[PDB]
Swiss-Prot record:
Residues 11-13 are annotated as: Interaction with U4 snRNA. Part of the core SMN complex that contains SMN1, GEMIN2/SIP1, DDX20/GEMIN3, GEMIN4, GEMIN5, GEMIN6, GEMIN7, GEMIN8 and STRAP/UNRIP. Part of the SMN-Sm complex that contains SMN1, GEMIN2/SIP1, DDX20/GEMIN3, GEMIN4, GEMIN5, GEMIN6, GEMIN7, GEMIN8, STRAP/UNRIP and the Sm proteins SNRPB, SNRPD1, SNRPD2, SNRPD3, SNRPE, SNRPF and SNRPG. Interacts with GEMIN2; the interaction is direct. Interacts with SMN1, SNRPB, SNRPD1, SNRPD2, SNRPD3 and SNRPE; the interaction is direct. Interacts with cytosolic DDX20/GEMIN3 and GEMIN4. Interacts with SNRNP70 and HNRNPU. The modification Phosphothreonine is found at residue 49. The chain holds residues 3 to 722 of 1508 of the full protein. The SMN complex catalyzes the assembly of small nuclear ribonucleoproteins (snRNPs), the building blocks of the spliceosome, and thereby plays an important role in the splicing of cellular pre-mRNAs. Most spliceosomal snRNPs contain a common set of Sm proteins SNRPB, SNRPD1, SNRPD2, SNRPD3, SNRPE, SNRPF and SNRPG that assemble in a heptameric protein ring on the Sm site of the small nuclear RNA to form the core snRNP (Sm core). This is Gem-associated protein 5. It comes from Homo sapiens (Human). It is linked to Neurodevelopmental disorder with cerebellar atrophy and motor dysfunction: An autosomal recessive disorder characterized by global developmental delay with predominantly motor abnormalities, axial hypotonia with decreased or absent reflexes, gait ataxia and appendicular spasticity. Affected individuals have cognitive impairment and speech delay. Brain imaging shows cerebellar atrophy. Changing residue 103 to R: In NEDCAM; uncertain significance. Changing residue 279 to E: Abolishes interaction with U4 snRNA. It is found in: Nucleus, Nucleoplasm; Nucleus, Gem; Cytoplasm. Changing residue 160 to R: In NEDCAM; uncertain significance. The record marks 31, 236, 279, 303, 325, 366, 370, 414, 489, 512 as: Interaction with U4 snRNA. The record marks 418, 574, 593, 617 as: Interaction with U4 snRNA and with the 7-methylguanosine cap of RNA molecules. The WD repeat domain mediates binding to U1 snRNA and to U4 snRNA. The WD repeat domain also mediates binding to the 7-methylguanosine cap that is found both on mRNA and snRNA molecules. The regions that bind snRNA molecules and the isolated 7-methylguanosine cap overlap at least partially. Besides, the WD repeat domain mediates interaction with the 60S large ribosomal subunit.
């Protein structure tokens, strides 16, 4: 197939944290990285599929990237500069995705930056204390300009003059300054009554300037007269601008709710765009494809990236994104394409991966959830029935086909929900949930307002035992649905059979709390393969257990196992998830806090493939139910990557 990537939402409230270069390359700041996107006939997508692809990630900054600008100089269209909350300004080469050179000249938090449209190596960056810094990376020269003690919001270099730079400030003041004359204020533009959000120059010599402010107005100044000549009032808010070179008469602005407007300059005549943004738009980026098509990309607080066809004024494609950790990934057993994602922004994403019109066809389910979704589980036989657990202990049951809010279980866990599972009830299918406090309880999906029955009562009454039952940290049903497994904080793995939960085996092999348990599917070539059980804990070592010998025994007295059938070693951090491949015999994928996902032949104990695209701790893995080479994985880097095992260059976890 083709690898995909669900990137983190672009950063909010940034005057210029995204840019594009002609031909089809768009970059946007998101968390501590910059994500590059090929756009147009350069992506090489199938017909019907939107012509874009994520291919790049700028890794390096230690905290939030607050600015990003591309070099528009010919021959240098592959160079870009970023500004971070760590006070660095790094120059990148996008072909190599490495840092050319960086500085740390700013002593106060950086606001924005911009690449000189007329100087091949000049970078101008401002900070919150009003300090402006001109930087040339060829000879590593820096001029320390200080204009006014006002917080800088936006900064834009003149396209036509090599030494003029316009600056917008939080108090509504706009000043124009000469870089050669020691930062001499050339003009002081007073008119705006709130924060300046965007400064746009006229792309034609002879000059003119445009500014958009939180006072809901757009002002157009004359750098000759040093005052405004026309004022446009829109009909919270961020007001960014775009003055297209092809249409010098027109001017495109953002508006309330992320609406976009195209201001004609014959009168106040505007045209409304349109599949529309639902929250305020921060940046507008234009790019021209090789196909001579003029597009405009928009980032917004609604966590989407939209590409607009300037000719039709309608939305070509929409790129969703994530705002939280990808806690949970689950594929529906009936809808092969449905990929449910549990995100730390309380919102459940269902990714129809089978959509042929759209590669990123994702649907959001926010209503009803107000906390991070740490567990998901599709119903085995029911299309659209999806259960979810939250970080504060709430258990739900969505209906993705309906439009109603989810059904929240009346019984909440005291801690975060670790995992969910569908199995047979004990006192057609019932819902099982494991809390962080150690309690596993069973929910009736039909009578859902009734209390949840704590299954530890059952374990104590069937298995003659008054023991203080351990802290349960896992639950995983056998494929047949006749055997249940529990993981515990000590590291034990109790095995249960029958409907009364007769404990018949305790697996004391791990030495920290269990974090994942997965049974092998029964579709394989051999039958005994169904009895294999993978498990991971806070130890970096993964164990496989064959339980055929004990389940066919079904002893009256439980047994204890201390030798594992297979031992997978290589990880260097705790294991978060393991999943058996449905397409192979004994093929296991594992995620770990080492930042890697690892495929191995669990039968021969052979490491096959190691995925290192993530820049954080992986929290979930799911095998693609339709492509035997494809795996989806999500991490605490706000990403979900879809990768192929054959295209990875490393076969083993790093050491």
């Amino acid at each position: 197939q083709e690898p995909r990537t669900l990137p983190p939402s672009p950063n909010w409230y940034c005057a210029r944290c995204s840019d594009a270069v002609p031909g089809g390359l768009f970059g946007f700041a998101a968390r501590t990285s910059v994500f590059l996107v090929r756009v147009g006939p350069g992506a090489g997508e199938s017909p019907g599929t939107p012509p874009f692809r994520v291919i790049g990630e700028l890794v390096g900054h230690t905290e939030r990237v607050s600015g990003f600008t591309f070099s528009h100089h010919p021959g240098q269209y592959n160079l870009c500069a970023t500004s971070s909350d760590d006070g660095t300004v790094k120059i990148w080469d996008v072909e190599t995705k490495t840092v050319v050179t960086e500085h740390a000249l700013h002593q106060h938090t950086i606001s924005t930056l911009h690449w000189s449209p007329r100087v091949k190596d000049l970078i101008v960056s401002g900070d919150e204390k009003g300090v402006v810094f001109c930087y040339w990376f060829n000879r590593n020269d820096s001029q320390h300009l200080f204009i006014e003690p006002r917080t800088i919001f936006c900064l834009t270099c003149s396209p036509h003059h090599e030494d003029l730079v316009a600056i917008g400030y939080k108090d509504g003041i706009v000043v124009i300054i000469d870089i050669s004359k020691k930062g001499e204020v050339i003009h002081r533009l007073r008119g705006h009554d709130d924060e300046i959000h965007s400064i746009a120059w006229c792309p034609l010599p002879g000059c003119y300037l445009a500014t958009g402010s939180k006072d809901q107005t757009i002002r157009i100044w004359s750098c000759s007269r040093g005052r405004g000549v026309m004022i446009l009032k829109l009909p919270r808010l961020w007001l960014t601008l775009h003055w297209p070179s092809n249409q010098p008469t027109q001017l495109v602005s953002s508006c309330f709710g992320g609406e976009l407007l195209q201001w004609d300059l014959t009168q106040r005549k505007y045209t409304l765009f349109s599949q529309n943004h639902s929250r305020i738009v921060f940046n507008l980026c234009p790019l021209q494809t090789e196909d001579d098509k003029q597009l405009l990309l928009s980032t917004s607080m609604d966590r989407d990236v939209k590409c607009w066809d300037i000719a039709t004024l309608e939305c070509s494609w929409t790129l969703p994104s994530l705002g939280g950790f990808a806690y949970s990934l689950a594929f529906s057993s009936v809808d092969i394409g449905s990929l449910a994602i549990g995100v730390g922004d309380g919102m459940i994403r269902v990714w129809n991966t089978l959509s042929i019109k759209n590669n990123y066809d994702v649907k959001n389910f926010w209503q009803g959830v107000k906390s991070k979704v740490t567990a998901l589980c599709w119903h085995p036989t029911k299309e659209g029935c999806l259960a979810f657990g939250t970080d504060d202990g709430k258990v739900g049951l969505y209906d993705t086909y309906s439009n109603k809010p989810p059904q929240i279980s009346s019984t909440y866990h005291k801690k975060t929900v670790y995992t969910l599972a569908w199995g047979p009830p004990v006192p057609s299918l019932a819902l099982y949930s494991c809390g962080g406090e150690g309690i596993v309880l069973q929910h009736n999906p039909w009578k859902l307002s009734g209390e949840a029955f704590d299954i530890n009562k059952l374990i104590r009454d069937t298995n003659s035992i008054k023991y203080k039952l351990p802290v349960h940290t896992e639950i995983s049903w056998k494929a047949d649905g006749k055997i249940m497994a529990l993981g515990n904080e000590d590291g034990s793995i109790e095995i249960f059979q029958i409907p009364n939960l007769k404990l018949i085996c305790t697996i004391q092999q791990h030495h920290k709390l269990v974090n994942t348990i997965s049974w092998h599917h029964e579709h394989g070539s051999q039958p005994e393969l169904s009895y294999l059980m993978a498990s991971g804990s806070n130890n970096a070592v993964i164990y496989v257990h064959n339980l055929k010998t004990v389940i066919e025994s079904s002893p009256e007295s439980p047994v204890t196992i201390t030798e594992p059938y297979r031992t997978l070693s290589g990880h260097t951090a705790k294991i978060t998830s393991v999943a058996w491949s449905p397409h192979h015999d004994g093929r296991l994928v594992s995620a770990s806090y080492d930042g890697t996902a690892q495929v191995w032949d669990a039968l021969r104990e052979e490491p096959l493939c190691n995925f290192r695209g993530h820049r954080g701790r992986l929290l979930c893995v799911a095998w693609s139910p339709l492509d035997p080479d494809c795996i989806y994985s999500g991490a605490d880097d706000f990403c979900v990557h879809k990768w192929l095992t054959s295209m990875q260059d490393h076969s083993r976890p790093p050491q």
